[PDB]
Amino acid sequence: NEIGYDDIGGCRKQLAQIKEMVELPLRHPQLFKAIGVKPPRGILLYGPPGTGKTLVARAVANESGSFFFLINGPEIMSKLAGESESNLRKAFEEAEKNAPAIIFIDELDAIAPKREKTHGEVERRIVSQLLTLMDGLKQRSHVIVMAATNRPNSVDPALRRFGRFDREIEIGIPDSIGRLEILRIHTRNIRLAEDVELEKIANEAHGHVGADLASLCSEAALQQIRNKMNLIIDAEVLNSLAVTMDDFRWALGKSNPSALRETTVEVPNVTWDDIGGLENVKRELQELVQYPVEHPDKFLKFGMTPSKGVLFYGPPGCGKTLLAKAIANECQANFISIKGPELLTMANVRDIFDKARQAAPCVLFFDELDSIAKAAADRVINQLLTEMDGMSAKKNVFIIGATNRPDIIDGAILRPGRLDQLIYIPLPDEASRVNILKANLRKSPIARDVDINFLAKATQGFSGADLTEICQRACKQAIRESIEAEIRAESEDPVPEITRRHFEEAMRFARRSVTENDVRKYEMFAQTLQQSRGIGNNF
Amino acid sequence: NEIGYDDIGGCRKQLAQIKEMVELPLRHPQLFKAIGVKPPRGILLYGPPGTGKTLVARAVANESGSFFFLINGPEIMSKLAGESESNLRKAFEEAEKNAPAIIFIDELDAIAPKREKTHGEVERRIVSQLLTLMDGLKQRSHVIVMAATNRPNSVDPALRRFGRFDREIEIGIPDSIGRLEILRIHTRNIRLAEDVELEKIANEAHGHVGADLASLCSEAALQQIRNKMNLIIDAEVLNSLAVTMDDFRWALGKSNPSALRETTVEVPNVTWDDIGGLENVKRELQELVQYPVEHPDKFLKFGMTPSKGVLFYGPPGCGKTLLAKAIANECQANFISIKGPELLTMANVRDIFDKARQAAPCVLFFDELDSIAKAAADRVINQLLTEMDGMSAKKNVFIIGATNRPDIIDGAILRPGRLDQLIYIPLPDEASRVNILKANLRKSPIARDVDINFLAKATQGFSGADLTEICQRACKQAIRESIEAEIRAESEDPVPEITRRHFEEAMRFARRSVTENDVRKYEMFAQTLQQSRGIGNNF
């Protein structure tokens, strides 16, 4: 029952990073003496609630082999004024007496809030004592101080300094692969039916931290019990209890994960095959994003630093969002998406650029920039420009912007050193429209009588989103006939695929979302955005 | 006199959940052992004041069969600091000593306010002690901690974490059926006249929580006593005391319920019969809302996910609110209505979307969107967009918007994934007008000389609101004639039905509300909203 590294999933990188700082010095002390390293003695784990950073603490407690002392934030603050000071002092004194040792301070924000913003005098005295104790740890003393907080910005800045907590590890939101690892860990003692495919549950559990995935496994078991209890304890029933995929899907539907609104920094699942049409832009994006990462030596050879800012602009529904996700996928680079409405609803723009820096190859995408232009907006745009200037081209963070309104985009964002690579995403041509329909219909069963070539030549001027709407309306016709066919059978297989007749009905009321007059305006700005940075038509 | 489950009405599902989480593990521990799920240990009951959560606590205390300890937040906070700390500690200690046990903390917000926003130090110490005690409950110990608050957002977020009050049950505003149940519960010991129909009172008591209904019964009985005494104790008078429907209606008229301004999440009472002539829109809304819920298998089969966003637009007074209510009714889905003025009058949009998520099949309606456009407005619209983008299409929450001003609707709301299903609600045609008049006159007696076809022919270009106005004017004419006839009879039924002369009088000054020029503009915007998302007529 004792927790170990095997009970933690989704943070393989972080655990190895912790081991290198807690276990490796003790196993091989001569490595650090040989090279002259100052091994870290302050480690701060941070991340949203439920990510498993108290679990990591329990793992290090039971695996490090060094004396472990656990300080709980609320426990210290629940004591009287004098007794909270003594417990902190006794914590460090015992650690130095039993070196090597690890002091773990869970819920550091409870002990060490910002002194400027702290009201009580006793609380501020505890923060001061912790700083004194942290500074009182001699280099000889083999004492590593670990801390965990889900509010890192609420901690006193003095503690996040050299010599004090100076190494920060993010136990963040797990990705799809990590979610599967957690589910496997939490289903080891739960009977599962043969139809349970935890891979699908992991892929569908967006926004779920390990704490949420633990609840999901628990709830699915209860739903299994509910089904049996409702029908009905006989031993046959007890031996027939096995969580089925239906229970997991029921649990996933009712689940309300706590990390839905957190920014995601995972590699997207969109590939080139999801776009297809924009061949030239694919090649251009590879050179702008892929080459600096894969072939950094060649750029050093030719002596010119790559520009790491791009701007997609064009008519709505032409794949600007898909392109940003596909390129990050090809490079296997993290992807942060910040839609324009999110920016306006929000020192938080600085955090986004901080997250992008932590993700070493990262594509930082600012979608729907037209919202800022159509609009706080001045503060948001100026903050973006300052952060872009603070992002060096030598760091593998690529900034991409997308706008459906190149007519109202501030020229400061196009300045060299900023989104100066201007890529125009036009309406698809007939050949492109064929590929878009093929891409959209991959998952759908289509009858042999459907000619995508005919659809492409009928959807002249149709944006990529419009073509998706035709497919959606084609499927709805198939579902309608499927339901009607089922009623006839019950009241007295029938439609297995999406036939041509469905597409005929789908295209009856279809109209292009971008008018030819609008296309003329977009083609005008394909020639004048580069020149929309001086006086222009303002005088 | 002891309170039990029979004394609680309206919250049947919540009581079932509480039984499953409290009683069922003890009856069949082997049932949980077999499937490897550990029952929960923290339950938070939340809801507006008076909904019966203290009543639920009393019921569980008298029915669970496990040691029950009650902690009243005001009682703890009325004691000195050490006394309050000792009382909490003793509560938890006694609960652990007499397991299985339930600790109920009534008014948890009084004990555990947000520490950042708490001024005193003793309060913070109490909150920290509560957290420590919650974390000190071992898995082996069979202690379930329950808490009740009418201000869940005022509770310390740390207490709503995993391993803490991690399961929340909403004891919310009862619906008509629940109101009838509560009224029946509270009329068990009150003598009722044979003419008392509690169903009508329950239907008419909008915004009444159980406490308001208890007060309503008490006030009706007081009104009966008052009426009897005003005439006048003789035993005949005492035995003639029976609450009549007049007393209940008087009490209901004088009652001022506390939950009037709370958002309602009930299934609406509007059916298709209240609309009539919008058959194509009815079928479309069925396909959009009902099919995903009833036939998810077909959507998964054809491989394309359904869009969960709709936008009604068209001339004013044509039935956009009625359509949303009726579609919510047909699917038996919960309905939340938020009007534009409400949004502008308000971190609360997130609350609306959370409520929508809790109601599993829910139609979230944003009516009178023209108010935002005519206007805080930017913040509201950006929050709406962000929340729409956070609502996955795999969850059965459907978002509908209605606007009488398609000319000033922000294009971001029409983006694919957002309210991209644009449905146009035109002025009714002659047959639609006939159906509207038939629907509006169902409850009203009408003379056989009234020809609805003639009215429909005369009301060319009239909206549904105008036809309802015509009906209201006819009824006013009938009431006036009835009053005049009554006066004549008293000073010396004559008007049993609404004759065609009344309709002739009503139609005399009736004019259409949507001009033909406005009809032309609406018909044009029926072609250009899909295209109002790029440059458009801005350059």
Ligand SMILES: Nc1ncnc2c1ncn2[C@@H]1O[C@H](COP(=O)(O)OP(=O)(O)OP(O)(O)=S)[C@@H](O)[C@H]1O
């Ligand atoms: N990465 C993970 N791998 C496996 N189980 C996990 C993981 N993260 C969370 N869990 C489970 O969910 C529980 C969450 O508890 P904690 O680890 O204390 O969460 P946390 O990281 O401490 O977040 P806070 O800030 O303390 S609320 C754990 O006890 C595990 O049972």
Ligand SMILES: Nc1ncnc2c1ncn2[C@@H]1O[C@H](COP(=O)(O)OP(=O)(O)OP(O)(O)=S)[C@@H](O)[C@H]1O
């Ligand atoms: N080239 C394309 N290939 C395949 N699908 C496409 C393409 N362009 C657009 N789509 C579809 O249209 C949807 C929206 O496209 P996006 O990638 O968001 O382009 P966009 O520039 O963001 O336009 P909007 O304003 O967001 S609709 C995608 O999710 C696809 O379903």
Ligand SMILES: Nc1ncnc2c1ncn2[C@@H]1O[C@H](COP(=O)(O)OP(=O)(O)OP(O)(O)=S)[C@@H](O)[C@H]1O
């Ligand atoms: N669902 C219900 N069924 C029956 N009676 C109810 C119900 N809800 C309230 N009542 C009655 O109204 C009284 C007040 O309800 P309480 O449960 O005491 O208040 P509450 O739900 O705790 O709200 P707060 O937040 O404590 S003011 C109860 O004692 C009952 O007499």
Ligand SMILES: Nc1ncnc2c1ncn2[C@@H]1O[C@H](COP(=O)(O)OP(=O)(O)OP(O)(O)=S)[C@@H](O)[C@H]1O
């Ligand atoms: N198709 C209809 N069938 C029956 N009654 C209708 C119809 N359209 C409108 N009405 C009547 O008019 C009232 C107002 O209609 P709504 O449902 O509010 O339509 P609307 O789109 O909201 O227009 P407004 O601006 O709110 S009046 C309803 O309560 C009905 O009494």
Ligand SMILES: [Mg+2]
């Ligand atoms: Mg923790």
Ligand SMILES: [Mg+2]
């Ligand atoms: Mg997009």
Ligand SMILES: [Mg+2]
């Ligand atoms: Mg109460």
Ligand SMILES: [Mg+2]
């Ligand atoms: Mg309305």
